[PDB]
Amino acid sequence: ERRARFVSKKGNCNVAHKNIREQGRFLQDVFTTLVDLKWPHTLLIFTMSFLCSWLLFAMVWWLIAFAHGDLAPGEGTNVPCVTSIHSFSSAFLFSIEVQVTIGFGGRMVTEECPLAILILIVQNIVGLMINAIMLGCIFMKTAQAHRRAETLIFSKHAVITLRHGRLCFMLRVGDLRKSMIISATIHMQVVRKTTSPEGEVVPLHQVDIPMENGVGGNSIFLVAPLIIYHVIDSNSPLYDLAPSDLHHHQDLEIIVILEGVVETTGITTQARTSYLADEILWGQRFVPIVAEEDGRYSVDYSKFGNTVKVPTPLCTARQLDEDRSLL
Amino acid sequence: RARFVSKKGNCNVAHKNIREQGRFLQDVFTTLVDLKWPHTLLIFTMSFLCSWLLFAMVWWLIAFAHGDLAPGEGTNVPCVTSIHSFSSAFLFSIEVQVTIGFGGRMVTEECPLAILILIVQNIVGLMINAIMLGCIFMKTAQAHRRAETLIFSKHAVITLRHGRLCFMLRVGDLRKSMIISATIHMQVVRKTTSPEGEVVPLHQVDIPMENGVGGNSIFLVAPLIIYHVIDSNSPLYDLAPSDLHHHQDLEIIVILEGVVETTGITTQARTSYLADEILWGQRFVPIVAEEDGRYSVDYSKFGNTVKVPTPLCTARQLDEDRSLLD
Amino acid sequence: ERRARFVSKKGNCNVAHKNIREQGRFLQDVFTTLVDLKWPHTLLIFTMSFLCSWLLFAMVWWLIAFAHGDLAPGEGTNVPCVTSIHSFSSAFLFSIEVQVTIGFGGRMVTEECPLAILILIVQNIVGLMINAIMLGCIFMKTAQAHRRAETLIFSKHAVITLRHGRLCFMLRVGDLRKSMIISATIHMQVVRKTTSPEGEVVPLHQVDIPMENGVGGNSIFLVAPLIIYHVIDSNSPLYDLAPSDLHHHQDLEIIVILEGVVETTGITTQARTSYLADEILWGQRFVPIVAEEDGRYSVDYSKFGNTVKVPTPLCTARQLDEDRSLL
Amino acid sequence: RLILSSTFRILADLLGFAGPLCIFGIVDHLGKENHVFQPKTQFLGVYFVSSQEFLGNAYVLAVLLFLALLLQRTFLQASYYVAIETGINLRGAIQTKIY
Amino acid sequence: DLQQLDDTTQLPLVSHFAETVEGLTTIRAFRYEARFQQKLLEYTDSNNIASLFLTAANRWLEVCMEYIGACVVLIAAATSISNSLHRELSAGLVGLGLT
Amino acid sequence: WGSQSSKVHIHHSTWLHFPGHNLRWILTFILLFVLVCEIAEGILSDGVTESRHLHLYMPAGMAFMAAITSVVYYHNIETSNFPKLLIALLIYWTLAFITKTIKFVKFYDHAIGFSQLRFCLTGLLVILYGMLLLVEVNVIRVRRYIFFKTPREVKPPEDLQDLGVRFLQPFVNLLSKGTYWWMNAFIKTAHKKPIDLR
């Protein structure tokens, strides 16, 4: 009726974590929690933190003025604790001036009441600390780089075809922006149900898939849309994959993880995708996407996931290897 | 039995005879970040209270020397207006450095010495703020609290997988935020004597992760099983369940690294398994079970172990028995 | 004469860059150069930047009041452009207040002169920009971690001796601080003026050296001092180091580079040392340093670099393979 | 080292008698009914106090007694240790000589 | 613990002296007097370091229990003088409060 | 102090008392004693006037706090062999000596005379401040850390470097040589761990 992916086509790890024995670890890390939130949620916490701080000390200043006797609407017999305080509105407006450091000067702190001097110190230190903390969280949200990872693009359906005789699992990845991702590194994993001879039953086993690079490494230079193909050798877990068992309800999935730092902010990112068994086109190829032009190369992203059919065996690499050896 | 690293990182090693040449405090800005938040608040408070009060004595003394402190008719032009007592000198120091600037206590043009101090207080006030903001930002980006949500099982197990013995282990991530570029290392801490008679007290021998590609890179979403295939090149190649008692010179250190996707700051999660924390011949229970719309990780069964049919002999005997049978 | 060092015992590469066809790249990286400056030197640039900025606009404010006729002696009929400007000294003080945002308010900006409104706008934009520039430079200076490398410690001289039959160039590196260097890495290189059979002459050839790690990698875990040895196999460039030619005027040097991100700040650091020919002692081992206490270990950093005499063959590793093969 | 032990003891012996002198000084000032009288001499109006008037106030002598007691009881104890440590070393160097 | 360590460390010392006198001829015969002197230094040093800590413990107690006594003197003198100015102790019990 | 809460190197760290460690403490204790005398005189004089006259003793009261920290600050620079921080201490002795001397000479201009105690104590403070100044300069002469290109660093004594030495009476600050403060840790250890030859 329905299939449960491991990761969606745009990352978004589709696994539900349950029975988390909470010890407050979610809330103890306040700072990383604030950054993870959206922007409209951040502004509310941004506003409430400042509004409460202004209002908390607004109650303090009004209370101090009330107790000092300068809230009596009469002749100025004494020297007021803080001048021009005639209501909570004046006290609340004065609190804004001190903490935002606007300092109009109509409501000025005098030297009469020593308590105000101590409270003025407390509000400045609290005001400085909130600003320092709020700026730090805003900078980590400005340096957020998950939005850049959304411009990293993977082909809708990957294909399996023959390369240099051997069979390989092809795949196309592209970069849309003009800013390079430094030291890109793409890992491929296959998530499948499997049992061990000893009696183990691992529900979603993740076996790393070698990328078959020119030096056996992982780093890929990503400017034009590459074709990331895994050469299906005798050690590959896809060594026994055939078009017969490449249908929808097959416990087969290929997770792809494209790491690499963003050159602008210097913040490492990640791009994730997966290919269900029905999202694979056996025995097809990716059309040439780059054509040289009068001045430079071109990349026709309109032909990104366009795949065409070509002659291809209908047997697994296991059967193909036996046929090659026997012949 | 002395531990190399505790169950929650916190390496249980105490150094001695540290011939410090002041490098303990020369890294002031690293030290300030390392301090706990309540200590940082005290240093934050003291660094500003002292600055306000250091210049409070300056303003009070300048107005004293100028002679406008005398409670009399303002025949002269005051050096800094409205300075009547040291309390007014202290409040004016708050206004200048914190840039409140009420304006009741102005800076007059008739005091060439006071203009210099107004320049000095602003530059020192700006310099203190910028330095203090930088320390706070490196403390807001601290990710040692994020590394505490990376979980390792209490006891690791040794069992047969694919006909070869291995040292299994389960490590899980609790938060939903991915840890990027994960990298897991494993080392054996044991005293090692060479054929030449060496005495190495704590020798660390790296252990391969038995990953399909050799590298240490792992993708942590579900709690993964990390195991070391005990081949002929392993230091655990001659471990028997008989010698797995409490006071056995054995320890496995597991170090999980990676950059937190939020702050971009690398982290480490250190755990160790003593000999009495190893469980020979036991299997980790299944944890992931598919549900209607997604998968499901039942963390209640995170460290549960079940017995498995395994030989009680060492890896060398297992290879030898296979060699004779072949 | 003397024998040069490629890198000194505390890093500090002793290489002199000469004939640099400078295209101004020194000054184009002002922000990088500003951080590279010493702290006393930074204060001068920090101070002179603000002091000039106040004094640049001090002349502007004084000229505006002069042209408007405000500083004409006497209580004139005109409304002052900026109040209480009766000297360049007053103009200097008003220049400080606007840019630092003290804003005493005895010298206000009136609504009469529109030129001063523009200059008030300009000074605030300049003040915010310069302050933002100085904040960023100081944040990267406070995030400097080069002084952390000063706490990374290497033994004064390394040794070559026996270990598990083979011959290894042993060493010792220690970390004095309590914080960790996440993802440590060790690269060892041999520097020698190496010629080639083809006829090439390389004035300083850097050949990498394996660390003889358990997993054939570079990652090390630095908590207590460790021994960074290199097994001298058939491919090791040190395969033909006889003890006879270990003297001073031998073109030989071992560079050791320890890298890893500091856990406190996240900044990567390098620690570099070089062992010259005279700084290698054949046939000596490192004393056991890690003792045991009631419930913890104990590192005797007094015995960090102490080496004892150990019996060993006085023949080259190449002659060890031949001797073993014949036996 | 034996001279150092004697130096501490000689000074602690002298400082020990500060107690009786402070007791004599404190009570003698309290044996006078007239407490309205006070030190009275002027140079500007700050009323500088002299030597004898300083050691006539009861509270001054009690504080000086407190300071003197700390010195006496610390010199005296330090005198014991220097004498004892020398004695232990004399035993250590004589047992070896006898052996 | 120190006094137990004080006694149990000097019993092997006297016995070591007695046994050397008993078998002096044998020790010189083996040329083992080099080792036995080194044992004496190990035996004597253990005896001295046990006594040095015992002396320090007595000195640690005596200094601390005399700053407490000194703090009493200041507290007693301060209150007694004040109570001799307001409650009129008449300086009689003040002296007993000091001596 | 905040780092000391989580400092493990001081678990068995070594020290190196700077040249003049004894002459520093004996002067400091003498200086602390005379500052108490000035406090006693200051509070003694103002009792006759109708006003508080806070300038008589509070300048001396602030000195007593500063003198105590000056030796706490010096000790923290003695345990950690980082003489460079003594410049702040050196400035204090240079600055305190100059200001106090100006006060002393101005007493003689008004002809205060030795018959007044405040003249004696102020004159005494000039000598104590001057001698403490020479102690700080003598540190630079033997350590050679501010200006000289090649500092003559000093290493902790070999007997102290032993982990097997725990009777640290011979090498501690002069206040702990008198009050036997170092024994506190050993005494507390005796309550949990019984005292043996270990």
Side-chain angles (χ1 to χ4, degrees), chain B residues 2 14 99 101 103 130 195 201, chain C residues 101 103 214 288 295:
Chain B
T99 59
Chain C
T101 60

PDB file of all heavy atoms in Angstrom, chain B residues 2 12-17 29 99-103 106 109 130 138 195 199 201 206, chain C residues 90 100-104 142 164 214-215 264 288-290 295-299 301-302, unseen atoms left out:
ATOM      1  N   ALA B   2      42.507   1.558  37.072  1.00  0.00           N
ATOM      2  CA  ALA B   2      42.565   2.871  36.446  1.00  0.00           C
ATOM      3  C   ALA B   2      42.015   2.817  35.029  1.00  0.00           C
ATOM      4  O   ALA B   2      42.371   1.934  34.245  1.00  0.00           O
ATOM      5  CB  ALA B   2      44.004   3.383  36.437  1.00  0.00           C
ATOM      6  N   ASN B  12      40.563   9.936  32.216  1.00  0.00           N
ATOM      7  CA  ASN B  12      40.933   9.738  33.616  1.00  0.00           C
ATOM      8  C   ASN B  12      42.446   9.644  33.781  1.00  0.00           C
ATOM      9  O   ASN B  12      42.973   8.697  34.357  1.00  0.00           O
ATOM     10  CB  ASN B  12      40.241   8.491  34.155  1.00  0.00           C
ATOM     11  N   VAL B  13      43.153  10.641  33.259  1.00  0.00           N
ATOM     12  CA  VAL B  13      44.607  10.702  33.324  1.00  0.00           C
ATOM     13  C   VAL B  13      44.999  12.032  33.945  1.00  0.00           C
ATOM     14  O   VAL B  13      44.550  13.090  33.492  1.00  0.00           O
ATOM     15  CB  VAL B  13      45.250  10.543  31.935  1.00  0.00           C
ATOM     16  N   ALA B  14      45.831  11.980  34.980  1.00  0.00           N
ATOM     17  CA  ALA B  14      46.288  13.166  35.688  1.00  0.00           C
ATOM     18  C   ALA B  14      47.768  13.372  35.404  1.00  0.00           C
ATOM     19  O   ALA B  14      48.579  12.471  35.638  1.00  0.00           O
ATOM     20  CB  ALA B  14      46.040  13.036  37.190  1.00  0.00           C
ATOM     21  N   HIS B  15      48.112  14.553  34.903  1.00  0.00           N
ATOM     22  CA  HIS B  15      49.491  14.868  34.577  1.00  0.00           C
ATOM     23  C   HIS B  15      50.242  15.327  35.819  1.00  0.00           C
ATOM     24  O   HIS B  15      49.651  15.790  36.797  1.00  0.00           O
ATOM     25  CB  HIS B  15      49.548  15.946  33.497  1.00  0.00           C
ATOM     26  N   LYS B  16      51.564  15.193  35.770  1.00  0.00           N
ATOM     27  CA  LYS B  16      52.414  15.539  36.897  1.00  0.00           C
ATOM     28  C   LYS B  16      53.662  16.256  36.402  1.00  0.00           C
ATOM     29  O   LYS B  16      54.083  16.081  35.257  1.00  0.00           O
ATOM     30  CB  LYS B  16      52.808  14.296  37.705  1.00  0.00           C
ATOM     31  N   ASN B  17      54.242  17.065  37.287  1.00  0.00           N
ATOM     32  CA  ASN B  17      55.492  17.781  37.024  1.00  0.00           C
ATOM     33  C   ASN B  17      55.390  18.653  35.776  1.00  0.00           C
ATOM     34  O   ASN B  17      56.335  18.757  34.992  1.00  0.00           O
ATOM     35  CB  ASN B  17      56.672  16.815  36.916  1.00  0.00           C
ATOM     36  N   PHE B  29      42.408  33.883  25.781  1.00  0.00           N
ATOM     37  CA  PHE B  29      41.122  33.802  25.106  1.00  0.00           C
ATOM     38  C   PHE B  29      40.648  32.371  24.927  1.00  0.00           C
ATOM     39  O   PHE B  29      39.445  32.147  24.773  1.00  0.00           O
ATOM     40  CB  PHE B  29      41.206  34.506  23.763  1.00  0.00           C
ATOM     41  N   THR B  99      27.985  54.056  26.919  1.00  0.00           N
ATOM     42  CA  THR B  99      27.414  54.906  25.875  1.00  0.00           C
ATOM     43  C   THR B  99      25.946  55.226  26.132  1.00  0.00           C
ATOM     44  O   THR B  99      25.184  55.470  25.194  1.00  0.00           O
ATOM     45  CB  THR B  99      27.568  54.235  24.498  1.00  0.00           C
ATOM     46  OG1 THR B  99      26.898  52.969  24.502  1.00  0.00           O
ATOM     47  CG2 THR B  99      29.022  53.862  24.245  1.00  0.00           C
ATOM     48  N   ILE B 100      25.524  55.225  27.395  1.00  0.00           N
ATOM     49  CA  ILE B 100      24.173  55.672  27.712  1.00  0.00           C
ATOM     50  C   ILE B 100      24.041  57.165  27.451  1.00  0.00           C
ATOM     51  O   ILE B 100      23.107  57.618  26.783  1.00  0.00           O
ATOM     52  CB  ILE B 100      23.806  55.322  29.161  1.00  0.00           C
ATOM     53  N   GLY B 101      24.987  57.948  27.961  1.00  0.00           N
ATOM     54  CA  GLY B 101      25.012  59.374  27.712  1.00  0.00           C
ATOM     55  C   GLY B 101      23.733  60.093  28.075  1.00  0.00           C
ATOM     56  O   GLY B 101      23.013  60.563  27.189  1.00  0.00           O
ATOM     57  N   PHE B 102      23.426  60.176  29.371  1.00  0.00           N
ATOM     58  CA  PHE B 102      22.234  60.901  29.792  1.00  0.00           C
ATOM     59  C   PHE B 102      22.333  62.376  29.432  1.00  0.00           C
ATOM     60  O   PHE B 102      21.344  62.989  29.020  1.00  0.00           O
ATOM     61  CB  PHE B 102      22.011  60.730  31.293  1.00  0.00           C
ATOM     62  N   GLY B 103      23.514  62.962  29.573  1.00  0.00           N
ATOM     63  CA  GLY B 103      23.709  64.350  29.229  1.00  0.00           C
ATOM     64  C   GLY B 103      23.538  65.331  30.362  1.00  0.00           C
ATOM     65  O   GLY B 103      23.761  66.529  30.160  1.00  0.00           O
ATOM     66  N   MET B 106      27.746  66.519  31.235  1.00  0.00           N
ATOM     67  CA  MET B 106      28.370  66.681  29.936  1.00  0.00           C
ATOM     68  C   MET B 106      29.884  66.767  30.069  1.00  0.00           C
ATOM     69  O   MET B 106      30.437  66.894  31.162  1.00  0.00           O
ATOM     70  CB  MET B 106      27.854  67.934  29.238  1.00  0.00           C
ATOM     71  N   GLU B 109      34.275  71.832  26.988  1.00  0.00           N
ATOM     72  CA  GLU B 109      35.436  72.092  26.152  1.00  0.00           C
ATOM     73  C   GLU B 109      36.577  72.761  26.906  1.00  0.00           C
ATOM     74  O   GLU B 109      37.667  72.906  26.344  1.00  0.00           O
ATOM     75  CB  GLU B 109      35.031  72.972  24.970  1.00  0.00           C
ATOM     76  N   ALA B 130      34.623  44.591  22.358  1.00  0.00           N
ATOM     77  CA  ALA B 130      34.924  43.740  21.213  1.00  0.00           C
ATOM     78  C   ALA B 130      35.601  42.451  21.650  1.00  0.00           C
ATOM     79  O   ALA B 130      35.311  41.374  21.116  1.00  0.00           O
ATOM     80  CB  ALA B 130      35.796  44.493  20.212  1.00  0.00           C
ATOM     81  N   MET B 138      32.555  32.537  20.786  1.00  0.00           N
ATOM     82  CA  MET B 138      33.212  31.240  20.818  1.00  0.00           C
ATOM     83  C   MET B 138      32.649  30.340  21.909  1.00  0.00           C
ATOM     84  O   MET B 138      32.831  29.122  21.844  1.00  0.00           O
ATOM     85  CB  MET B 138      34.715  31.421  21.002  1.00  0.00           C
ATOM     86  N   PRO B 195      59.700  -7.822  21.854  1.00  0.00           N
ATOM     87  CA  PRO B 195      60.715  -8.878  21.962  1.00  0.00           C
ATOM     88  C   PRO B 195      62.023  -8.368  22.529  1.00  0.00           C
ATOM     89  O   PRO B 195      62.733  -9.115  23.213  1.00  0.00           O
ATOM     90  CB  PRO B 195      60.876  -9.358  20.514  1.00  0.00           C
ATOM     91  CG  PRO B 195      59.581  -9.038  19.872  1.00  0.00           C
ATOM     92  CD  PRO B 195      59.103  -7.770  20.510  1.00  0.00           C
ATOM     93  N   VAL B 199      59.152  -1.595  27.816  1.00  0.00           N
ATOM     94  CA  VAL B 199      58.106  -1.401  28.819  1.00  0.00           C
ATOM     95  C   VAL B 199      57.309  -0.181  28.370  1.00  0.00           C
ATOM     96  O   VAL B 199      57.642   0.960  28.707  1.00  0.00           O
ATOM     97  CB  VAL B 199      58.667  -1.212  30.231  1.00  0.00           C
ATOM     98  N   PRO B 201      53.900   1.535  28.979  1.00  0.00           N
ATOM     99  CA  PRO B 201      52.786   1.401  29.931  1.00  0.00           C
ATOM    100  C   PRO B 201      51.417   1.424  29.270  1.00  0.00           C
ATOM    101  O   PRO B 201      50.616   0.505  29.484  1.00  0.00           O
ATOM    102  CB  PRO B 201      52.998   2.593  30.875  1.00  0.00           C
ATOM    103  CG  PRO B 201      53.793   3.569  30.078  1.00  0.00           C
ATOM    104  CD  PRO B 201      54.693   2.751  29.218  1.00  0.00           C
ATOM    105  N   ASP B 206      45.858   1.152  16.842  1.00  0.00           N
ATOM    106  CA  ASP B 206      44.639   1.478  16.120  1.00  0.00           C
ATOM    107  C   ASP B 206      43.941   0.209  15.642  1.00  0.00           C
ATOM    108  O   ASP B 206      44.576  -0.808  15.355  1.00  0.00           O
ATOM    109  CB  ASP B 206      44.948   2.389  14.935  1.00  0.00           C
TER     110      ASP B 206
ATOM    111  N   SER C  90      35.569  72.130  20.937  1.00  0.00           N
ATOM    112  CA  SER C  90      34.176  71.708  21.034  1.00  0.00           C
ATOM    113  C   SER C  90      33.785  70.850  19.840  1.00  0.00           C
ATOM    114  O   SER C  90      33.036  69.879  19.983  1.00  0.00           O
ATOM    115  CB  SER C  90      33.259  72.927  21.133  1.00  0.00           C
ATOM    116  N   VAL C 100      31.176  57.595  18.677  1.00  0.00           N
ATOM    117  CA  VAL C 100      31.157  56.635  19.779  1.00  0.00           C
ATOM    118  C   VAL C 100      29.753  56.412  20.317  1.00  0.00           C
ATOM    119  O   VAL C 100      29.523  55.434  21.040  1.00  0.00           O
ATOM    120  CB  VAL C 100      32.120  57.113  20.882  1.00  0.00           C
ATOM    121  N   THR C 101      28.805  57.272  19.946  1.00  0.00           N
ATOM    122  CA  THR C 101      27.412  57.232  20.382  1.00  0.00           C
ATOM    123  C   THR C 101      27.247  57.546  21.860  1.00  0.00           C
ATOM    124  O   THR C 101      26.282  57.094  22.481  1.00  0.00           O
ATOM    125  CB  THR C 101      26.799  55.852  20.075  1.00  0.00           C
ATOM    126  OG1 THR C 101      27.540  54.836  20.761  1.00  0.00           O
ATOM    127  CG2 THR C 101      26.993  55.497  18.608  1.00  0.00           C
ATOM    128  N   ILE C 102      28.170  58.302  22.454  1.00  0.00           N
ATOM    129  CA  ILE C 102      27.954  58.782  23.816  1.00  0.00           C
ATOM    130  C   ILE C 102      26.775  59.738  23.848  1.00  0.00           C
ATOM    131  O   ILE C 102      25.841  59.579  24.643  1.00  0.00           O
ATOM    132  CB  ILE C 102      29.228  59.446  24.369  1.00  0.00           C
ATOM    133  N   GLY C 103      26.785  60.730  22.962  1.00  0.00           N
ATOM    134  CA  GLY C 103      25.689  61.669  22.853  1.00  0.00           C
ATOM    135  C   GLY C 103      25.344  62.368  24.146  1.00  0.00           C
ATOM    136  O   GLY C 103      24.277  62.127  24.718  1.00  0.00           O
ATOM    137  N   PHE C 104      26.241  63.223  24.636  1.00  0.00           N
ATOM    138  CA  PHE C 104      25.939  63.986  25.841  1.00  0.00           C
ATOM    139  C   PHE C 104      24.726  64.881  25.623  1.00  0.00           C
ATOM    140  O   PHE C 104      23.797  64.896  26.437  1.00  0.00           O
ATOM    141  CB  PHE C 104      27.153  64.809  26.260  1.00  0.00           C
ATOM    142  N   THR C 142      41.040  37.082  18.660  1.00  0.00           N
ATOM    143  CA  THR C 142      40.669  36.330  19.850  1.00  0.00           C
ATOM    144  C   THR C 142      40.457  34.855  19.542  1.00  0.00           C
ATOM    145  O   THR C 142      40.579  34.018  20.442  1.00  0.00           O
ATOM    146  CB  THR C 142      39.408  36.942  20.466  1.00  0.00           C
ATOM    147  N   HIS C 164      60.048  -4.934  17.495  1.00  0.00           N
ATOM    148  CA  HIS C 164      59.451  -6.064  16.789  1.00  0.00           C
ATOM    149  C   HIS C 164      60.304  -6.464  15.586  1.00  0.00           C
ATOM    150  O   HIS C 164      59.831  -6.576  14.454  1.00  0.00           O
ATOM    151  CB  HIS C 164      58.015  -5.749  16.374  1.00  0.00           C
ATOM    152  N   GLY C 214      48.324   1.772  13.251  1.00  0.00           N
ATOM    153  CA  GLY C 214      47.676   0.471  13.244  1.00  0.00           C
ATOM    154  C   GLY C 214      46.804   0.246  12.023  1.00  0.00           C
ATOM    155  O   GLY C 214      46.707  -0.874  11.517  1.00  0.00           O
ATOM    156  N   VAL C 215      46.158   1.300  11.536  1.00  0.00           N
ATOM    157  CA  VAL C 215      45.249   1.203  10.403  1.00  0.00           C
ATOM    158  C   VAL C 215      45.841   1.852   9.154  1.00  0.00           C
ATOM    159  O   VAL C 215      45.112   2.160   8.215  1.00  0.00           O
ATOM    160  CB  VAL C 215      43.876   1.802  10.737  1.00  0.00           C
ATOM    161  N   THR C 264      38.556  23.824  21.880  1.00  0.00           N
ATOM    162  CA  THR C 264      37.980  25.013  22.497  1.00  0.00           C
ATOM    163  C   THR C 264      37.398  25.953  21.450  1.00  0.00           C
ATOM    164  O   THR C 264      36.257  26.410  21.579  1.00  0.00           O
ATOM    165  CB  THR C 264      39.038  25.731  23.335  1.00  0.00           C
ATOM    166  N   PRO C 288      59.973   4.488  30.065  1.00  0.00           N
ATOM    167  CA  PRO C 288      58.545   4.447  30.399  1.00  0.00           C
ATOM    168  C   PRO C 288      58.162   5.671  31.212  1.00  0.00           C
ATOM    169  O   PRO C 288      58.807   6.002  32.207  1.00  0.00           O
ATOM    170  CB  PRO C 288      58.407   3.155  31.213  1.00  0.00           C
ATOM    171  CG  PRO C 288      59.603   2.341  30.856  1.00  0.00           C
ATOM    172  CD  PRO C 288      60.700   3.326  30.601  1.00  0.00           C
ATOM    173  N   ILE C 289      57.101   6.350  30.778  1.00  0.00           N
ATOM    174  CA  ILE C 289      56.712   7.632  31.341  1.00  0.00           C
ATOM    175  C   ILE C 289      55.384   7.555  32.079  1.00  0.00           C
ATOM    176  O   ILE C 289      55.197   8.229  33.097  1.00  0.00           O
ATOM    177  CB  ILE C 289      56.668   8.724  30.247  1.00  0.00           C
ATOM    178  N   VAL C 290      54.454   6.730  31.605  1.00  0.00           N
ATOM    179  CA  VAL C 290      53.110   6.682  32.171  1.00  0.00           C
ATOM    180  C   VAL C 290      53.131   5.709  33.345  1.00  0.00           C
ATOM    181  O   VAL C 290      53.173   4.493  33.158  1.00  0.00           O
ATOM    182  CB  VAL C 290      52.063   6.285  31.130  1.00  0.00           C
ATOM    183  N   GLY C 295      43.869   5.585  41.319  1.00  0.00           N
ATOM    184  CA  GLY C 295      42.737   5.483  40.422  1.00  0.00           C
ATOM    185  C   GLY C 295      42.922   6.243  39.125  1.00  0.00           C
ATOM    186  O   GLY C 295      41.946   6.566  38.442  1.00  0.00           O
ATOM    187  N   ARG C 296      44.170   6.535  38.775  1.00  0.00           N
ATOM    188  CA  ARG C 296      44.465   7.303  37.574  1.00  0.00           C
ATOM    189  C   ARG C 296      45.888   6.989  37.139  1.00  0.00           C
ATOM    190  O   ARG C 296      46.649   6.340  37.859  1.00  0.00           O
ATOM    191  CB  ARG C 296      44.281   8.805  37.813  1.00  0.00           C
ATOM    192  N   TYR C 297      46.232   7.445  35.941  1.00  0.00           N
ATOM    193  CA  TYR C 297      47.588   7.313  35.444  1.00  0.00           C
ATOM    194  C   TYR C 297      48.402   8.546  35.829  1.00  0.00           C
ATOM    195  O   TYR C 297      47.894   9.501  36.420  1.00  0.00           O
ATOM    196  CB  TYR C 297      47.581   7.089  33.936  1.00  0.00           C
ATOM    197  N   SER C 298      49.689   8.528  35.493  1.00  0.00           N
ATOM    198  CA  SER C 298      50.593   9.600  35.893  1.00  0.00           C
ATOM    199  C   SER C 298      51.696   9.722  34.858  1.00  0.00           C
ATOM    200  O   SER C 298      52.454   8.771  34.646  1.00  0.00           O
ATOM    201  CB  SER C 298      51.183   9.332  37.278  1.00  0.00           C
ATOM    202  N   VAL C 299      51.791  10.885  34.224  1.00  0.00           N
ATOM    203  CA  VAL C 299      52.803  11.150  33.214  1.00  0.00           C
ATOM    204  C   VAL C 299      53.902  11.985  33.847  1.00  0.00           C
ATOM    205  O   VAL C 299      53.647  13.085  34.348  1.00  0.00           O
ATOM    206  CB  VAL C 299      52.201  11.863  31.994  1.00  0.00           C
ATOM    207  N   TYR C 301      56.456  14.203  33.084  1.00  0.00           N
ATOM    208  CA  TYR C 301      56.993  15.042  32.022  1.00  0.00           C
ATOM    209  C   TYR C 301      58.428  15.473  32.282  1.00  0.00           C
ATOM    210  O   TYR C 301      59.060  16.031  31.379  1.00  0.00           O
ATOM    211  CB  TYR C 301      56.104  16.266  31.814  1.00  0.00           C
ATOM    212  N   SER C 302      58.952  15.241  33.488  1.00  0.00           N
ATOM    213  CA  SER C 302      60.384  15.409  33.709  1.00  0.00           C
ATOM    214  C   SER C 302      61.179  14.450  32.837  1.00  0.00           C
ATOM    215  O   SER C 302      62.250  14.799  32.329  1.00  0.00           O
ATOM    216  CB  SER C 302      60.715  15.197  35.183  1.00  0.00           C
TER     217      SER C 302
END
